[PDB]
Protein backbone atom coordinates (compact mmCIF):
# COMPACT_ATOMS: atom_id res chain seq x y z
CA UNK A 1 0.00 0.00 0.00
CA UNK A 2 2.16 2.99 -1.21
CA UNK A 3 1.30 6.69 -0.98
CA UNK A 4 2.31 8.77 -3.92
CA UNK A 5 2.75 12.51 -4.05
CA UNK A 6 2.67 14.17 -7.47
CA UNK A 7 3.91 17.79 -7.78
CA UNK A 8 1.90 19.53 -10.49
CA UNK A 9 -1.64 18.96 -11.74
CA UNK A 10 -0.95 19.86 -15.37
CA UNK A 11 -1.40 17.43 -18.17
CA UNK A 12 1.32 14.99 -17.10
CA UNK A 13 0.34 15.04 -13.44
CA UNK A 14 -3.40 14.43 -13.81
CA UNK A 15 -2.93 11.78 -16.44
CA UNK A 16 -0.29 9.96 -14.37
CA UNK A 17 -2.67 9.96 -11.39
CA UNK A 18 -5.23 8.33 -13.70
CA UNK A 19 -2.70 5.74 -14.95
CA UNK A 20 -1.68 4.95 -11.38
CA UNK A 21 -5.38 4.53 -10.39
CA UNK A 22 -6.12 2.20 -13.31
CA UNK A 23 -2.97 0.14 -12.52
CA UNK A 24 -4.44 -0.22 -9.00
CA UNK A 25 -1.68 1.77 -7.32
CA UNK A 26 -3.55 3.07 -4.29
CA UNK A 27 -3.01 6.40 -2.63
CA UNK A 28 -2.18 9.23 -4.96
CA UNK A 29 -2.35 13.02 -3.98
CA UNK A 30 -1.31 15.74 -6.16
CA UNK A 31 -0.03 19.19 -5.31
CA UNK A 32 -0.58 22.17 -7.64
CA UNK A 33 0.93 25.59 -6.97
CA UNK A 34 -1.94 27.41 -8.79
CA UNK A 35 -4.72 28.58 -6.44
CA UNK A 36 -7.46 27.24 -8.74
CA UNK A 37 -7.11 25.05 -11.87
CA UNK A 38 -7.79 26.90 -15.08
CA UNK A 39 -8.44 25.87 -18.72
CA UNK A 40 -5.40 27.88 -19.88
CA UNK A 41 -3.43 27.37 -23.12
CA UNK A 42 -4.19 27.02 -26.78
CA UNK A 43 -4.49 24.03 -29.16
CA UNK A 44 -2.39 20.91 -28.66
CA UNK A 45 -2.03 17.64 -30.53
CA UNK A 46 -2.56 14.21 -29.03
CA UNK A 47 -0.85 11.55 -31.14
CA UNK A 48 -2.70 8.26 -31.78
CA UNK A 49 -0.66 6.24 -29.18
CA UNK A 50 -1.45 8.77 -26.42
CA UNK A 51 -5.16 8.84 -27.47
CA UNK A 52 -4.96 5.06 -27.22
CA UNK A 53 -3.78 5.50 -23.60
CA UNK A 54 -6.45 8.10 -22.80
CA UNK A 55 -9.14 5.81 -24.30
CA UNK A 56 -7.76 2.91 -22.26
CA UNK A 57 -8.27 5.09 -19.19
CA UNK A 58 -11.91 5.64 -20.22
CA UNK A 59 -11.59 9.11 -21.75
CA UNK A 60 -12.60 8.14 -25.31
CA UNK A 61 -16.01 9.80 -25.47
CA UNK A 62 -15.01 12.86 -23.49
CA UNK A 63 -12.32 13.39 -26.14
CA UNK A 64 -14.77 12.62 -28.94
CA UNK A 65 -17.13 15.31 -27.70
CA UNK A 66 -14.33 17.98 -27.39
CA UNK A 67 -11.44 17.42 -29.73
CA UNK A 68 -11.11 17.26 -33.52
CA UNK A 69 -10.10 13.96 -35.19
CA UNK A 70 -7.58 15.57 -37.58
CA UNK A 71 -7.53 13.33 -40.65
CA UNK A 72 -5.21 15.35 -42.88
CA UNK A 73 -2.06 17.45 -43.00
CA UNK A 74 -1.47 19.73 -46.07
CA UNK A 75 1.74 21.66 -46.68
CA UNK A 76 0.94 24.53 -49.03
CA UNK A 77 3.28 26.74 -51.11
CA UNK A 78 3.41 30.54 -51.03
CA UNK A 79 0.72 30.84 -53.71
CA UNK A 80 -1.72 28.59 -51.76
CA UNK A 81 -1.12 25.38 -53.68
CA UNK A 82 -1.04 22.01 -51.91
CA UNK A 83 2.49 20.70 -52.38
CA UNK A 84 2.43 17.80 -49.89
CA UNK A 85 -0.49 16.00 -48.36
CA UNK A 86 -0.79 13.19 -45.84
CA UNK A 87 -3.47 11.29 -43.97
CA UNK A 88 -3.62 11.56 -40.18
CA UNK A 89 -5.19 9.48 -37.36
CA UNK A 90 -7.43 6.53 -38.25
CA UNK A 91 -7.21 7.19 -42.02
CA UNK A 92 -3.44 6.93 -41.85
CA UNK A 93 -3.61 3.44 -40.33
CA UNK A 94 -3.77 4.13 -36.63
CA UNK A 95 -6.18 2.27 -34.43
CA UNK A 96 -7.11 5.61 -32.78
CA UNK A 97 -7.45 9.20 -33.91
CA UNK A 98 -4.91 11.90 -33.48
CA UNK A 99 -6.87 14.50 -31.49
CA UNK A 100 -6.31 18.23 -31.84
CA UNK A 101 -7.65 19.79 -28.70
CA UNK A 102 -7.71 22.92 -26.59
CA UNK A 103 -5.16 22.35 -23.79
CA UNK A 104 -7.43 23.65 -21.02
CA UNK A 105 -10.36 21.68 -22.25
CA UNK A 106 -8.03 18.57 -22.04
CA UNK A 107 -6.95 19.60 -18.56
CA UNK A 108 -10.64 19.87 -17.41
CA UNK A 109 -11.41 16.39 -18.76
CA UNK A 110 -8.41 15.11 -16.85
CA UNK A 111 -9.29 17.06 -13.72
CA UNK A 112 -12.89 15.75 -13.69
CA UNK A 113 -11.73 12.14 -14.22
CA UNK A 114 -9.25 12.36 -11.26
CA UNK A 115 -11.84 14.14 -9.05
CA UNK A 116 -14.56 11.56 -9.82
CA UNK A 117 -12.30 8.50 -9.46
CA UNK A 118 -10.27 9.31 -6.38
CA UNK A 119 -12.30 11.99 -4.65
CA UNK A 120 -12.16 15.81 -4.71
CA UNK A 121 -9.56 15.59 -1.96
CA UNK A 122 -6.92 14.10 -4.32
CA UNK A 123 -6.09 17.48 -5.95
CA UNK A 124 -4.61 19.93 -3.42
CA UNK A 125 -4.81 23.22 -5.17
CA UNK A 126 -2.85 26.27 -3.87
CA UNK A 127 0.07 24.11 -2.74
CA UNK A 128 3.44 24.53 -4.41
CA UNK A 129 6.31 22.20 -3.60
CA UNK A 130 9.28 24.24 -2.33
CA UNK A 131 11.54 21.98 -0.23
CA UNK A 132 12.33 18.29 -0.80
CA UNK A 133 14.41 15.64 1.10
CA UNK A 134 14.68 11.81 0.96
CA UNK A 135 15.09 10.40 4.47
CA UNK A 136 14.84 6.68 5.44
CA UNK A 137 12.56 5.28 2.67
CA UNK A 138 10.39 8.38 2.85
CA UNK A 139 10.08 11.60 0.83
CA UNK A 140 9.52 14.71 2.93
CA UNK A 141 8.10 17.83 1.37
CA UNK A 142 7.97 21.47 2.32
CA UNK A 143 5.08 23.24 0.66
CA UNK A 144 3.59 26.72 0.96
CA UNK A 145 -0.11 27.41 0.70
CA UNK A 146 -2.56 30.21 -0.28
CA UNK A 147 -1.89 33.27 1.86
CA UNK A 148 1.61 32.03 2.69
CA UNK A 149 1.65 29.36 5.45
CA UNK A 150 4.25 26.52 5.20
CA UNK A 151 3.08 22.89 5.10
CA UNK A 152 4.94 19.61 5.68
CA UNK A 153 3.95 16.50 3.76
CA UNK A 154 5.45 13.03 3.42
CA UNK A 155 5.15 10.24 0.86
CA UNK A 156 6.61 6.93 -0.37
CA UNK A 157 7.16 8.26 -3.94
CA UNK A 158 7.44 11.81 -5.19
CA UNK A 159 6.67 12.28 -8.91
CA UNK A 160 7.85 15.63 -10.26
CA UNK A 161 5.31 16.49 -12.91
CA UNK A 162 5.80 20.23 -12.40
CA UNK A 163 6.46 21.45 -16.00
CA UNK A 164 8.99 23.83 -17.53
CA UNK A 165 9.97 25.48 -14.20
CA UNK A 166 10.05 22.24 -12.28
CA UNK A 167 11.16 22.55 -8.70
CA UNK A 168 11.70 18.75 -8.40
CA UNK A 169 14.03 18.80 -11.41
CA UNK A 170 15.92 21.77 -9.90
CA UNK A 171 16.27 19.82 -6.61
CA UNK A 172 17.54 16.74 -8.41
CA UNK A 173 19.74 18.50 -10.95
CA UNK A 174 21.17 21.56 -9.22
CA UNK A 175 23.91 21.75 -11.86
CA UNK A 176 21.51 21.98 -14.76
CA UNK A 177 22.04 24.37 -17.66
CA UNK A 178 19.38 27.14 -17.94
CA UNK A 179 16.57 26.61 -20.46
CA UNK A 180 18.16 26.20 -23.91
CA UNK A 181 16.89 28.63 -26.60
CA UNK A 182 16.17 26.95 -29.89
CA UNK A 183 16.46 30.27 -31.78
CA UNK A 184 12.81 30.48 -32.97
CA UNK A 185 10.14 32.93 -31.65
CA UNK A 186 6.59 31.63 -31.48
CA UNK A 187 3.18 33.27 -31.34
CA UNK A 188 0.15 31.15 -30.63
CA UNK A 189 -3.53 31.83 -30.85
CA UNK A 190 -7.12 30.87 -31.69
CA UNK A 191 -9.32 32.47 -34.32
CA UNK A 192 -12.98 31.74 -35.08
CA UNK A 193 -13.91 30.60 -38.61
CA UNK A 194 -17.24 29.60 -40.14
CA UNK A 195 -15.59 26.99 -42.27
CA UNK A 196 -11.94 26.12 -42.38
CA UNK A 197 -11.68 23.49 -45.04
CA UNK A 198 -13.59 20.35 -43.89
CA UNK A 199 -13.05 21.28 -40.24
CA UNK A 200 -10.47 18.56 -39.56
CA UNK A 201 -7.45 19.32 -41.73
CA UNK A 202 -4.19 20.74 -40.50
CA UNK A 203 -2.43 23.37 -42.64
CA UNK A 204 1.36 23.99 -42.70
CA UNK A 205 3.32 26.67 -44.73
CA UNK A 206 6.56 28.68 -44.83
CA UNK A 207 8.36 31.71 -46.19
CA UNK A 208 11.49 31.93 -48.24
CA UNK A 209 12.53 33.63 -44.97
CA UNK A 210 11.56 30.50 -42.94
CA UNK A 211 8.54 32.06 -41.28
CA UNK A 212 6.32 29.04 -40.70
CA UNK A 213 2.58 28.68 -40.06
CA UNK A 214 0.58 25.88 -38.56
CA UNK A 215 -3.21 26.16 -38.39
CA UNK A 216 -5.73 23.44 -37.49
CA UNK A 217 -9.19 23.16 -35.93
CA UNK A 218 -9.30 22.06 -32.26
CA UNK A 219 -12.98 22.21 -31.13
CA UNK A 220 -15.75 19.59 -31.56
CA UNK A 221 -18.25 21.92 -29.79
CA UNK A 222 -17.69 24.60 -32.45
CA UNK A 223 -17.88 22.05 -35.27
CA UNK A 224 -21.21 20.81 -33.86
CA UNK A 225 -22.51 24.38 -34.15
CA UNK A 226 -21.28 24.67 -37.82
CA UNK A 227 -18.25 26.77 -36.74
CA UNK A 228 -14.54 26.15 -36.54
CA UNK A 229 -12.06 27.11 -33.78
CA UNK A 230 -8.77 27.33 -35.65
CA UNK A 231 -5.57 27.12 -33.61
CA UNK A 232 -2.54 28.77 -35.15
CA UNK A 233 1.19 28.90 -34.51
CA UNK A 234 3.57 31.40 -36.10
CA UNK A 235 7.24 30.49 -35.92
CA UNK A 236 9.86 33.14 -36.74
CA UNK A 237 13.69 32.99 -36.48
CA UNK A 238 14.70 34.91 -33.37
CA UNK A 239 17.58 36.38 -35.35
CA UNK A 240 14.82 38.33 -37.20
CA UNK A 241 12.99 39.36 -34.06
CA UNK A 242 15.40 40.41 -31.34
CA UNK A 243 14.57 39.69 -27.72
CA UNK A 244 10.85 39.81 -27.12
CA UNK A 245 11.01 38.88 -23.46
CA UNK A 246 13.28 37.86 -20.60
CA UNK A 247 10.83 35.09 -19.75
CA UNK A 248 9.61 31.72 -20.94
CA UNK A 249 6.02 31.42 -19.71
CA UNK A 250 3.12 29.39 -21.19
CA UNK A 251 0.69 32.30 -20.51
CA UNK A 252 2.58 35.34 -21.93
CA UNK A 253 0.32 37.67 -23.95
CA UNK A 254 1.84 38.55 -27.33
CA UNK A 255 1.33 41.49 -29.69
CA UNK A 256 -0.34 41.63 -33.08
CA UNK A 257 2.20 44.30 -34.04
CA UNK A 258 5.20 41.98 -33.36
CA UNK A 259 4.02 39.00 -35.43
CA UNK A 260 1.97 40.54 -38.28
CA UNK A 261 4.85 42.35 -40.02
CA UNK A 262 6.30 38.87 -40.69
CA UNK A 263 3.21 37.56 -42.40
CA UNK A 264 1.89 40.70 -44.09
CA UNK A 265 3.45 40.01 -47.52
CA UNK A 266 1.71 36.61 -47.71
CA UNK A 267 -0.78 36.04 -50.46
CA UNK A 268 -2.09 32.51 -50.15
CA UNK A 269 -5.25 33.39 -52.14
CA UNK A 270 -7.70 30.96 -50.50
CA UNK A 271 -6.43 31.48 -46.89
CA UNK A 272 -5.95 35.02 -45.45
CA UNK A 273 -3.14 35.03 -42.81
CA UNK A 274 -3.53 38.71 -42.05
CA UNK A 275 -7.23 38.01 -41.25
CA UNK A 276 -6.26 34.94 -39.20
CA UNK A 277 -3.89 36.93 -36.93
CA UNK A 278 -6.06 40.04 -36.92
CA UNK A 279 -9.21 38.33 -35.69
CA UNK A 280 -7.41 36.39 -32.97
CA UNK A 281 -9.23 35.97 -29.68
CA UNK A 282 -5.86 35.53 -28.02
CA UNK A 283 -2.20 35.94 -28.93
CA UNK A 284 0.50 34.40 -26.79
CA UNK A 285 4.27 34.58 -27.31
CA UNK A 286 6.81 31.95 -26.39
CA UNK A 287 10.51 31.44 -27.28
CA UNK A 288 11.11 27.92 -28.53
CA UNK A 289 13.03 26.33 -25.66
CA UNK A 290 14.12 22.93 -24.51
CA UNK A 291 16.53 21.46 -21.98
CA UNK A 292 19.68 19.44 -22.57
CA UNK A 293 19.46 15.59 -22.45
CA UNK A 294 20.07 14.31 -18.90
CA UNK A 295 21.96 11.00 -18.35
CA UNK A 296 19.53 10.29 -15.49
CA UNK A 297 16.24 11.66 -14.23
CA UNK A 298 15.58 10.58 -10.67
CA UNK A 299 17.23 9.42 -7.52
CA UNK A 300 15.86 7.12 -4.86
CA UNK A 301 12.12 7.52 -4.49
CA UNK A 302 11.85 10.78 -6.45
CA UNK A 303 11.36 10.74 -10.16
CA UNK A 304 10.51 13.11 -13.06
CA UNK A 305 7.68 13.08 -15.63
CA UNK A 306 6.49 15.32 -18.53
CA UNK A 307 8.19 18.67 -19.24
CA UNK A 308 9.92 18.31 -15.81
CA UNK A 309 11.72 15.23 -17.22
CA UNK A 310 12.18 16.24 -20.87
CA UNK A 311 11.02 19.74 -21.99
CA UNK A 312 10.92 19.78 -25.79
CA UNK A 313 10.05 22.24 -28.57
CA UNK A 314 6.23 22.39 -28.75
CA UNK A 315 5.72 20.77 -32.16
CA UNK A 316 4.23 17.61 -33.51
CA UNK A 317 4.17 14.78 -30.99
CA UNK A 318 6.09 16.51 -28.18
CA UNK A 319 4.52 17.76 -25.00
CA UNK A 320 1.29 16.21 -23.81
CA UNK A 321 1.68 13.00 -25.90
CA UNK A 322 5.00 12.25 -24.23
CA UNK A 323 3.75 13.18 -20.73
CA UNK A 324 0.70 10.90 -21.02
CA UNK A 325 2.97 8.06 -22.25
CA UNK A 326 5.40 8.62 -19.35
CA UNK A 327 2.50 8.12 -16.91
CA UNK A 328 1.46 4.86 -18.46
CA UNK A 329 5.04 3.57 -18.08
CA UNK A 330 5.39 4.78 -14.48
CA UNK A 331 2.16 3.14 -13.33
CA UNK A 332 3.20 -0.03 -15.15
CA UNK A 333 6.72 0.09 -13.63
CA UNK A 334 5.33 0.68 -10.10
CA UNK A 335 2.79 -2.18 -10.57
CA UNK A 336 5.44 -4.65 -11.72
CA UNK A 337 8.22 -4.13 -9.13
CA UNK A 338 7.59 -4.17 -5.37
CA UNK A 339 10.94 -2.38 -4.76
CA UNK A 340 9.99 1.31 -5.45
CA UNK A 341 13.45 2.73 -6.27
CA UNK A 342 14.11 -0.05 -8.77
CA UNK A 343 10.63 0.52 -10.29
CA UNK A 344 11.29 4.28 -10.63
CA UNK A 345 14.62 3.45 -12.34
CA UNK A 346 12.95 0.89 -14.59
CA UNK A 347 10.39 3.54 -15.63
CA UNK A 348 13.04 6.11 -16.81
CA UNK A 349 15.29 3.61 -18.46
CA UNK A 350 12.24 2.87 -20.51
CA UNK A 351 11.44 6.58 -21.18
CA UNK A 352 14.68 8.62 -20.94
CA UNK A 353 16.62 7.34 -24.01
CA UNK A 354 13.62 7.87 -26.29
CA UNK A 355 13.12 11.41 -24.85
CA UNK A 356 16.79 12.20 -25.36
CA UNK A 357 16.61 10.81 -28.95
CA UNK A 358 13.85 13.30 -29.71
CA UNK A 359 15.56 16.25 -28.07
CA UNK A 360 18.77 15.70 -30.08
CA UNK A 361 16.94 15.09 -33.43
CA UNK A 362 14.72 18.15 -33.07
CA UNK A 363 17.80 20.36 -32.45
CA UNK A 364 19.54 18.89 -35.46
CA UNK A 365 16.53 19.23 -37.84
CA UNK A 366 16.09 22.79 -36.62
CA UNK A 367 19.80 23.57 -37.08
CA UNK A 368 19.86 22.17 -40.64
CA UNK A 369 16.74 24.03 -41.77
CA UNK A 370 18.09 27.31 -40.36
CA UNK A 371 21.46 26.82 -42.13
CA UNK A 372 19.55 26.15 -45.41
CA UNK A 373 17.35 29.25 -44.95
CA UNK A 374 20.44 31.39 -44.43
CA UNK A 375 22.20 30.72 -47.75
CA UNK A 376 21.54 33.36 -50.54
C1 LIG B 1 -1.04 27.49 -18.08
C2 LIG B 1 -0.40 26.63 -19.12
C3 LIG B 1 -0.69 26.86 -20.49
C4 LIG B 1 -0.08 26.04 -21.44
N1 LIG B 1 -0.33 26.26 -22.78
C5 LIG B 1 0.26 25.43 -23.74
C6 LIG B 1 0.03 25.59 -25.10
O1 LIG B 1 -0.72 26.46 -25.48
N2 LIG B 1 0.65 24.79 -26.01
C7 LIG B 1 1.48 23.77 -25.58
O2 LIG B 1 2.07 23.02 -26.34
N3 LIG B 1 1.70 23.62 -24.26
C8 LIG B 1 1.11 24.42 -23.34
N4 LIG B 1 1.40 24.19 -22.03
C9 LIG B 1 2.45 23.15 -21.75
C10 LIG B 1 1.88 21.73 -21.87
O3 LIG B 1 0.82 21.52 -20.94
C11 LIG B 1 2.95 20.70 -21.58
O4 LIG B 1 4.09 21.02 -22.30
C12 LIG B 1 2.62 19.24 -21.92
O5 LIG B 1 1.24 19.02 -22.22
C13 LIG B 1 3.09 18.34 -20.76
O6 LIG B 1 2.58 18.88 -19.57
P1 LIG B 1 3.24 18.74 -18.11
O7 LIG B 1 2.21 18.24 -17.17
O8 LIG B 1 4.56 18.01 -18.09
O9 LIG B 1 3.53 20.27 -17.71
P2 LIG B 1 2.43 21.42 -17.48
O10 LIG B 1 1.12 21.26 -18.22
O11 LIG B 1 3.07 22.73 -17.76
O12 LIG B 1 2.11 21.22 -15.93
C14 LIG B 1 2.96 21.66 -14.90
C15 LIG B 1 2.03 21.94 -13.72
O13 LIG B 1 2.73 21.94 -12.49
C16 LIG B 1 2.51 23.17 -11.81
N5 LIG B 1 3.68 23.49 -10.99
C17 LIG B 1 4.80 24.19 -11.36
N6 LIG B 1 5.65 24.23 -10.31
C18 LIG B 1 5.06 23.59 -9.26
C19 LIG B 1 5.47 23.34 -7.94
N7 LIG B 1 6.43 24.07 -7.36
N8 LIG B 1 4.63 22.61 -7.12
C20 LIG B 1 3.41 22.13 -7.55
N9 LIG B 1 3.04 22.40 -8.85
C21 LIG B 1 3.84 23.11 -9.69
C22 LIG B 1 2.18 24.18 -12.89
O14 LIG B 1 1.35 25.20 -12.42
C23 LIG B 1 1.41 23.32 -13.87
O15 LIG B 1 0.04 23.23 -13.56
C24 LIG B 1 0.79 25.00 -21.06
C25 LIG B 1 1.05 24.78 -19.69
C26 LIG B 1 0.46 25.59 -18.73
C27 LIG B 1 0.79 25.34 -17.28
From Swiss-Prot:
Pathway given in the UniProt record: Secondary metabolite biosynthesis; pyocyanine biosynthesis
Binding-site residues for FAD, renumbered to this chain: 11-12, 32-33, 40-42, 103, 129, 188, 307
Reaction(s) this enzyme catalyzes, per UniProt: 5-methyl-phenazine-1-carboxylate + NADH + O2 + 2 H(+) = pyocyanin + CO2 + NAD(+) + H2O
Cofactor(s), by name: FAD
Alphabetically ordered keywords of this record: FAD, Flavoprotein, Monooxygenase, NAD, Oxidoreductase
Listed Basic and acidic residues bias regions: 365-376
InterPro entries on file: FAD-bd (IPR002938), FAD-dep_Monooxygenase_BioMet (IPR050493), FAD/NAD-bd_sf (IPR036188)
An MF annotation (GO) of this entry: 5-methylphenazine-1-carboxylate 1-monooxygenase (NADH) activity
Top-level taxon: Bacteria
EC number: 1.14.13.218
Function: Involved in the biosynthesis of pyocyanine, a blue-pigmented phenazine derivative, which plays a role in virulence. Catalyzes the oxidative decarboxylation of 5-methylphenazine-1-carboxylate (5-methyl-PCA) to pyocyanine. Can also act on phenazine-1-carboxylate (PCA), converting it into 1-hydroxyphenazine (1-HP). However, PCA is a poor substrate.
SUBUNIT field: Monomer in solution. Probably interacts transiently with PhzM.
Protein name from the UniProt record: 5-methylphenazine-1-carboxylate 1-monooxygenase
Organism: Pseudomonas aeruginosa (strain ATCC 15692 / DSM 22644 / CIP 104116 / JCM 14847 / LMG 12228 / 1C / PRS 101 / PAO1)
Lineage: Bacteria, Pseudomonadati, Pseudomonadota, Gammaproteobacteria, Pseudomonadales
Gene for this chain: phzS
Amino acid sequence: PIDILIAGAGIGGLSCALALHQAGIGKVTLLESSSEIRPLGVGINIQPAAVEALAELGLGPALAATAIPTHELRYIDQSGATVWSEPRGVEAGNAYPQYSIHRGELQMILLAAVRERLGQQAVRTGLGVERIEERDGRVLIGARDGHGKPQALGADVLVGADGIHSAVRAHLHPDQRPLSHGGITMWRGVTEFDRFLDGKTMIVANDEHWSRLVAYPISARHAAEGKSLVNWVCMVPSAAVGQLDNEADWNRDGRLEDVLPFFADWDLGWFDIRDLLTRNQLILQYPMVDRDPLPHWGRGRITLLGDAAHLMYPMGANGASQAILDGIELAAALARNADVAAALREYEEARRPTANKIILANREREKEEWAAASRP
